[PDB]
Structure 1
Amino acid sequence: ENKTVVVTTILESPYVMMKKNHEMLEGNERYEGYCVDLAAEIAKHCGFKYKLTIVGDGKYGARDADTKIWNGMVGELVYGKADIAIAPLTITLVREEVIDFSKPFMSLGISIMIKKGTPIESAEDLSKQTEIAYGTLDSGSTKEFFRRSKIAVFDKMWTYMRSAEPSVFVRTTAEGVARVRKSKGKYAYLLESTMNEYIEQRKPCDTMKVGGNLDSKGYGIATPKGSSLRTPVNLAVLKLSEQGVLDKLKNKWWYDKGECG
């Protein structure tokens, strides 16, 4: 109701993407995606004006164990470069310790992406074998999941992953997909089911989600501690949930324009 709200987001399909013609557009009109639509609904239910900005270091948010600094969208909120994050940003404990999250707007889990035909059905399968390399996004909740897991199978996978040479990790999702596509069934990618399910409906239609999800978690809208936005945004997400907006949006951006029939 007083100041333009600065929004940190990340270029990640289908959440935030450059519009074909963006170079001829100004401001928020540059971008399109599920999070852009969601930003707009949240902004009008809460009554604020906003500026979309893409995170500077193109990352999600992790705390460096020696430096102690938060990078990613999280750091932008921690250090006060942004007022709010509207992104496929996973609700985790170490983040919820330093920022607040709204209730989840998307439910998801860690899943496996394979090039179609790869003889893999599950995480147990991957752990039990050696021909097919597999990794995660370099920085993010998927990598931490494996880092911290006490469960045999995921420990076994982490043990392999962190020592694998050359690196099984990737700077971006799109980097992970491309490596799956290019690697003849010899790389499998570990990513949240949402992104898996999106790519699966994307040409050349050569990838696929196998098996069950490895976990159950959420993406949440993040705000810095003490923000006057915390409560109105949490309420808006619930309103958008209850009225079916979040299902319309997921359908719009995953399935309405799916290329694999």
Structure 2
Amino acid sequence: ANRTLIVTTILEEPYVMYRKSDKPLYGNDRFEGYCLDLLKELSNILGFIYDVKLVPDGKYGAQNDKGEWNGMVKELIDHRADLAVAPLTITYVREKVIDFSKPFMTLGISILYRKGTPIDSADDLAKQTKIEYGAVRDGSTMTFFKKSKISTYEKMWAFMSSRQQTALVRNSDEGIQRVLTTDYALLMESTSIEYVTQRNCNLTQIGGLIDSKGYGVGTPIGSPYRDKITIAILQLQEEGKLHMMKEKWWRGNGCP
């Protein structure tokens, strides 16, 4: 039989979450979400079983000043996993070091905050001095700011980086808690903003999308699975299955 593929992933609602059960769950059964459904579909099409393993460092992946990676990206570079199936953003810097499938979803960075302020854009947010802001450490949103040559975003990066211990959060849950309990706005991806703002009516998006990009399945460079996964994604796309999966995991409207 074909070797069981190792899948690196990360907890991120509603892509990957612990299943709620009153009885013990083991192995893959512990998890559910859009990305687990995606894996069930991909594995049927490609003919494999898999072992889902949460990334040990809890990070998506960024490189330090020495060019050393962490998170799921490092797991792929180091051939610790066969696939990364997660809301993993397809970026220029990552594409040079891993192979991504074609995208299964598109999104852009925007701002999550509480309601009640006149802040209407990133320009507004960068200019004012009352509300702090940041991003999840070692993800693509942090990297977007670090690499930007747009003045507003360069200033925002300098601010986040100056207050890195403060401004850059460990994960999306910490970021959202910070938004809810302190004067802090979180830079994050639009599909996640859509999800949370339909569940907690104290939260809102500020402004529009600042960029546009996709999520893809990651594989190590040269992986014989990447093209097969791309073909499977296109199948699911064209059959309307990806659309159905989005509806299943995002439904339904909870806030005015």
Q: State the Cα RMSD in Å.
A: 1.6
- What's the CA shift for 1:122? 0.6
Partner of 2:24: 24
Summarize the alignment of residues 57-206 of structure 1 with structure 2, pairs less than 5 Å apart: 57-66=57-66, 68-164=67-163, 167-183=166-182, 186-203=183-200, 205-206=201-202
Partner of 2:36: 36
Instruction: Give the counterpart letter for 1:234 in structure 2.
Output: T
Is the 8 Å Cα contact of residues 22 and 30 (structure 1) preserved in structure 2? no
Is the 8 Å Cα contact of residues 100 and 219 (structure 2) preserved in structure 1? yes
Structure 1 residues 155, 216: closer, same or farther in 2, change over 3 A?
same
- What's the CA shift for 1:56? 0.8
Is the 8 Å Cα contact of residues 114 and 188 (structure 1) preserved in structure 2? yes
Match 1:223 to one of 219, 227, 230: 219
C-alpha distance in 2 between matches for 1:46 and 1:14 = 24
Is the 8 Å Cα contact of residues 10 and 87 (structure 1) preserved in structure 2? yes
Partner of 2:204: 208
Structure 1 residues 30, 156: closer, same or farther in 2, change over 3 A?
same
C-alpha distance in 2 between matches for 1:54 and 1:196 = 23
Instruction: Give the counterpart letter for 1:214 in structure 2.
Output: I
* Structure 1, unaligned runs of 5 or more: none
Match 1:250 to one of 246, 249, 254: 246
C-alpha distance in 2 between matches for 1:8 and 1:215 = 26
Structure 1 residues 149, 23: closer, same or farther in 2, change over 3 A?
farther
Instruction: Give the counterpart letter for 1:222 in structure 2.
Output: G
Is the 8 Å Cα contact of residues 22 and 31 (structure 1) preserved in structure 2? no
C-alpha distance in 1 between matches for 2:206 and 2:185 = 10
* Structure 2, unaligned runs of 5 or more: none
SS at match of 1:89: coil
- What's the CA shift for 1:165? 7.3
Larger mean Cα displacement after TM superposition, 154-163 or 127-136: 154-163
Deviations 1:63-106 (A, max 9, x none): 2223x432111111111110000000000111111110011101
- What's the CA shift for 1:14? 0.7
- What's the CA shift for 1:26? 2.3
Partner of 2:11: 11
Partner of 1:237: 233
Instruction: Give the counterpart letter for 1:30 in structure 2.
Output: R
C-alpha distance in 1 between matches for 2:81 and 2:35 = 16
SS at match of 1:81: coil
Deviations 1:162-216 (A, max 9, x none): 2237621100101111111112xx211100111111111113x210112110001
Deviations 1:198-246 (A, max 9, x none): 111113x210112110001011101111212111100011111111111
Aligned length: 256
Is the 8 Å Cα contact of residues 6 and 83 (structure 1) preserved in structure 2? yes
Structure 1 residues 22, 36: closer, same or farther in 2, change over 3 A?
farther
C-alpha distance in 2 between matches for 1:124 and 1:10 = 31
C-alpha distance in 2 between matches for 1:41 and 1:218 = 19
Give the % identical residues.
53
